Design a protein around this ligand. Structure first.
Ligand SMILES: Cc1cc2nc3c(=O)[nH]c(=O)nc-3n(C[C@H](O)[C@H](O)[C@H](O)COP(=O)(O)OP(=O)(O)OC[C@H]3O[C@@H](n4cnc5c(N)ncnc54)[C@H](O)[C@@H]3O)c2cc1C
Ligand SMILES: Cc1cc2nc3c(=O)[nH]c(=O)nc-3n(C[C@H](O)[C@H](O)[C@H](O)COP(=O)(O)OP(=O)(O)OC[C@H]3O[C@@H](n4cnc5c(N)ncnc54)[C@H](O)[C@@H]3O)c2cc1C
Ligand SMILES: CN(C(=O)[C@H]1CC1(C)C)c1cccnc1
Ligand SMILES: CN(C(=O)[C@H]1CC1(C)C)c1cccnc1
Ligand SMILES: [Br-]
Ligand SMILES: [Mg+2]
Ligand SMILES: [Mg+2]
Lengths: 483, 485
């Protein structure tokens, strides 16, 4: 049939775009996805990666993982129970997560049923012609044509996909996609990658591992979580270690084979070896463009595989747009959502708007978690003559009593010292993701450190640290650190 | 002889003291009655918050939270013998005691490792407008430990629980004794609808022995006057859902010791109840008496708090009052801000006034409140058109947790004329942490569109603040309605 807009991918960005165009601009909209509910074989489905195999399940599972800390920490506050009766039933967690995800899948289905002028098509979308999306049975372009959709405008919103290194024994390794469906919690697991997904999963597995289990995280580079504040990177390495995770830095899997008992035998380029039940590859995500047959319309790609866009999410081909991870800009659900909103307003509203990819509040659901917004000091040091760093690090009192004396809360404010303007705020510790949200609004309003210090604290909180730093800890002048 | 003499080594008194000494190389004496926490005088070096307020309360509310975490864990697949679960109150109090003592010791450190700054022990009162007398007791006619000369005198003696003069008030405790109970009460009546009564009901609720019952009574119809109405009704539910009994329109007429040591409480409605503890938390009042304010003519207010202008100045030159003795917003960070402003003014020659508007604060209820600025009722009497944005969802984790009663409430009250945020009110896990940076937003004159144009952090409760674009209703010239004309 004929549509004002065809969206390929029913994810974070695609549903924002498709709903807005139908409901706010009264366009006739078609959206395509490969599955109506979560899990094998295509993992992402109606709802997107975040709903099905990202933010949503992972948050529920980290929340589950956090009770390992609460059960132990309760004792400092005089809670007593039979420690030897304690089991982390991973099957109950997964079943709980699956229902939660299926409920979302179902509500999106009902949304398509209940919303006139917004139509779902199941299967594989690809570009036939610059105004025709073909929906097929499989990813294979030979496969049978379920639909052919005439389209004034086409939005590519197919998101990203885990990266698997071409090494021998790749086949004995999983991504985060399979991790969400492990039938049993691995006794020993290697997470491969120093990024948020490896770290967040190392925490999940560490809490639900059967007795005498072990979690190992490996990263090629010296220090996990590049892109994050360096003090936070080092402090989070220490606090993961304190909770019994083995962080193997400057190490990479050369090869995986099977022990005769089917457990996975890891050889690191360093001549180290490890035997584990699971190797989870979390080394990167690449934009999903192969199946889109973008050759048929000549949509400009990067070598990486990303769809190249201007600031308004417009491709080199007019009437064809891309938003979300497929653009390989910032791979976060609220950024994809913002891109979809901004696009539809631009194209169908004539309310021209670009997404601002700077000063984007984000979190890592590590144990403990990270909250961050804006520049780290190294980046700011290259762009500003004078950078001030305000830093407060302290084990909070609750965590003297709790027994987790290692759980130091870190708060860091990075400023342009020439005028006090806050460039970056970086938090590690319980509450960090909740604290940082309204800090996003502060940086949109060009808050200065005097706007933080002059704000009266909420006490007792971790957050009030942000409002109690009067004096820099150190500086960068012309890119050079100075204590 | 001292540049500054401070009566009270509390939240307000120490900030002024340390700032004066370390920023303006001034010479400061601080008076308090006690060097560490607990009986006989409860407050000590560090003040009410450190010794018998925010600090031990937050530790004890954190303890209480484990009752919820242990239950909730099951939804995520945690399995243990529920029948083995015990709440060792005695452990909690010992742990709290050690935590507070370390802070008492931390503050003694500060006075030591700080030149000019020196602690004097005993009771401050005013002899003359430039001489403080540290006595041995709260009797004006006890020995004179010291005579102190003062170019400037700061009054920071804080507040004190009010005990309603009913028959058998000697059988009741304040929050002061609640912190040192040797055993957790099985039956407890917390008297009052304020944050202290509500917080303590939560604590007693988690540590009560088996067959236990926490009852909260309030003299009027709805707890937490001065907080957002939606939140007041919601907290009331969630406390009920967690087995706390809320008695509204009820107030004790008297208390009698039963022969077994328990308390027979007779209400005004004629209702009775037996409880192991009656904790009165009906209000706190400024510690004005033991200063002798007849004896230099400092003027109190129609409510008993030291009268101050915006610079914390009394009618008497050289004499200031900050914190709870001023009987305004009884919060530690307000005391601290006042003290910092006073010293930056008087000694720093950088005059600065505390902003008593747009103050972020919290109730460590289970679950907690975080709030900053005007509730809609107040806004609606000041602004022609007021918009209320409201989102109330049980967050997903509390589907699986089994605590479906834990609804997160996010309210933004705006000036609808220009969209300026007047108030933000949160109920739910994380509300006190969420609200701090909301305080900064309101100082920067954040509009509702600064919130909704900010990209959310997903998944959080906080991101709901950045997802509200459409008012839920309005007040127009004081009048509530779904729609504008
Ligand atoms: C483990 C994990 C955890 C994450 N955690 C967070 C977090 O906590 N917070 C956060 O903000 N971000 C998080 N992210 C990132 C977030 O999930 C993504 O940024 C976001 O989902 C991308 O939205 P999008 O619209 O670009 O694509 P997606 O939401 O991934 O949507 C793409 C959709 O397109 C479909 N599709 C693909 N190809 C085709 C085709 N040819 N035809 C039809 N349909 C197709 C897929 O089935 C999928 O549903 C996480 C990601 C992962 C993997
Ligand atoms: C149970 C409870 C919980 C609270 N929780 C919080 C909370 O979570 N957050 C929050 O912000 N606020 C909270 N508060 C309020 C907070 O404690 C006060 O607002 C704050 O302590 C007031 O500071 P201040 O400087 O006014 O006096 P205080 O901190 O009370 O200091 C006054 C000091 O003066 C001393 N003193 C009195 N008379 C004399 C005298 N004649 N000579 C010498 N010394 C004297 C006392 O010993 C006391 O140490 C709570 C209060 C209570 C009671
Ligand atoms: C996707 N991502 C990044 O690209 C990180 C490099 C950063 C720090 C911007 C991410 C993940 C979690 C939280 N924040 C950001
Ligand atoms: C002390 N106090 C009040 O007097 C409340 C009535 C208010 C809302 C102004 C308080 C307690 C906790 C958080 N905020 C404020
Ligand atoms: Br590195
Ligand atoms: Mg439809
Ligand atoms: Mg000294």
């Amino acid at each position: 049939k004929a549509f004002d807009l065809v969206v390929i991918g029913a994810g974070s960005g695609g549903l924002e775009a498709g709903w807005n165009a139908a409901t706010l601009y009264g366009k006739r909209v078609a959206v395509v996805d490969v599955q109506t509910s979560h899990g094998p074989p295509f993992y992402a489905a109606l709802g997107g990666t975040c709903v099905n195999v990202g933010c949503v399940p992972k948050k529920l599972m980290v929340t589950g993982a956090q009770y390992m800390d609460h059960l132990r920490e309760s004792a400092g506050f005089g809670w007593e129970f039979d420690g030897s009766s304690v089991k982390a039933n991973w099957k109950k967690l997964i079943a709980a997560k699956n229902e939660a995800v299926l409920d979302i899948n179902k509500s999106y289905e009902g949304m398509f049923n209940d919303t006139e002028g917004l139509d779902f098509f199941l299967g594989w979308g690809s570009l036939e012609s610059k105004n025709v999306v073909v929906v097929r049975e499989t990813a294979d372009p030979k496969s049978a044509v379920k639909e052919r959709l005439q389209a004034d405008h086409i939005l590519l919103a197919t998101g990203s996909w885990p990266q698997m290194p071409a090494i021998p024994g790749i086949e004995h390794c999983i991504s985060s996609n399979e991790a969400f469906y492990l039938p049993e919690p691995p006794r020993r697991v290697l997470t491969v990658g120093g990024g948020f997904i490896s770290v967040e999963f190392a925490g999940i597995f560490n809490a639900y591992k059967p007795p005498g289990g072990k979690v190992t995280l490996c990263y090629r580079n010296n220090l996990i979580l590049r892109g994050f504040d360096e003090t936070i990177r080092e402090e989070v390495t220490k606090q993961l270690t304190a909770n019994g995770i083995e962080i193997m830095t400057n190490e990479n899997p050369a090869k995986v084979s099977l022990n005769t008992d089917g457990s996975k035998h890891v050889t690191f380029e360093s001549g180290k070896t490890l035997d584990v039940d699971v190797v989870m590859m979390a080394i990167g995500r690449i934009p999903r463009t192969n199946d889109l047959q973008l050759g048929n319309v000549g949509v400009k790609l990067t070598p990486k595989g990303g769809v190249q866009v201007d600031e308004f999410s417009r491709t080199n081909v007019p009437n064809i747009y891309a938003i979300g991870d497929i653009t390989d800009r910032l791979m976060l659900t609220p950024v994809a959502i913002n891109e979809g909103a901004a696009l539809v307003d631009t194209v169908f509203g004539n309310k021209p708007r670009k997404t601002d990819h700077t000063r984007v509040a984000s979190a890592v659901f590590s144990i403990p978690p990270i909250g961050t917004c804006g520049l780290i000091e190294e980046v700011a040091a290259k762009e500003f003559e004078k950078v001030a760093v305000y830093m407060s690090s302290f084990t909070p009192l609750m965590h003297n009593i709790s027994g987790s004396k290692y759980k130091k809360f870190v708060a860091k404010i990075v400023t342009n010292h020439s005028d006090g303007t806050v460039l970056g705020v970086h938090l590690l510790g319980d509450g960090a993701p909740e604290i940082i949200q309204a800090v996003g609004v502060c940086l949109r309003l060009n808050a200065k450190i005097s706007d933080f210090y002059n704000t009266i604290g909420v006490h007792p909180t971790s957050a009030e640290e942000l409002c109690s730093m009067r004096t820099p800890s150190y500086y960068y002048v012309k890119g050079e650190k100075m204590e």
